[PDB]
Symmetry: C4
Subunit: 94 residues, 4 copies
């Protein structure tokens, strides 16, 4: 029940690690939820059209779709930006 | 077969790292399995209705769906809570 | 082109970090590929039947499906086990 | 509003951690986008055919599909390779 090799004691500071993977992932979603349902749309009805990458072919057929993922890598970073500042200040505790 | 640059020796303490990504992810699922099949439902037949976020439109159409992901970020954290305490004590070894 | 705040220099030892997320994830899949196409099946035609969790209902309807995810958390750990030992020794370099 | 146990102050250097999970994942996609839409195809119209793993059966029916995931683990590593070098030098700032 206590100290051998299969069971060290209680699941130690593996606690924060697990929390890392479990809450980081959870965080990941909120981040995107915002960008896919708010951000992307906004940028779409204002500053310009949404996307452009259904672009290629090349004596074979690669894709500019590559770029698209980057372009968003770019706007996906952004949402975090706007997230941190809007949240760092308006931190209400209920 | 031994020491150059492409092969250092044996796959060293990359061991725990791999285990991190492989078992953290695995953990992630159990966490959710609980929340999606037990927790969420419970909170649904008792303390109140499940969700509310199919809410928006805005001279364009963003979404409160944003919130939903957060609201769950909130309840997804919770399941971990109840998980740790119910498990930290009832730690049986078969 | 060099040292301000937006661009530090070259994408530094963020290199290993990126490699972590990019190759750990990649690893994650191989791990599972094995368990879903080899391991799980094996354990299914020999030591016994595959799974059991389509089990519940409870004056509401939660699920033992919860367990299933754990049971596999258990066998998903295993595949890593058998993976490391079978690979640590049979390390051929082509 | 300040220092108790539920709220430490402001969401501290959990900042980089979150950024890790949020941008590493984001990175992960671009990596693959390239390999699935450019790399894999290329290697397919030139150096040879794409894949081979729809291979097995074994007095039961396991799969070489196992290998496939590894083979790609191999080519998925590669794309990173070509990514870093093509990018480390052509680092333009707009």
């Amino acid at each position: 029940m206590l100290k051998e090799f299969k069971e060290f004691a209680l699941k130690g500071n593996v606690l924060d690690l697990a929390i890392a993977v479990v809450m980081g992932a959870a965080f990941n979603k909120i981040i995107c939820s915002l960008v896919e349902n708010i951000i992307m749309p906004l940028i779409g009805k204002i500053f310009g059209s949404v996307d452009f990458a259904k672009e290629w072919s090349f004596w074979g057929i690669k894709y500019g779709l590559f770029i698209q993922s980057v372009i968003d890598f770019i706007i996906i970073a952004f949402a975090l930006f706007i997230f941190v500042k809007i949240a760092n200040t308006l931190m209400k505790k209920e």
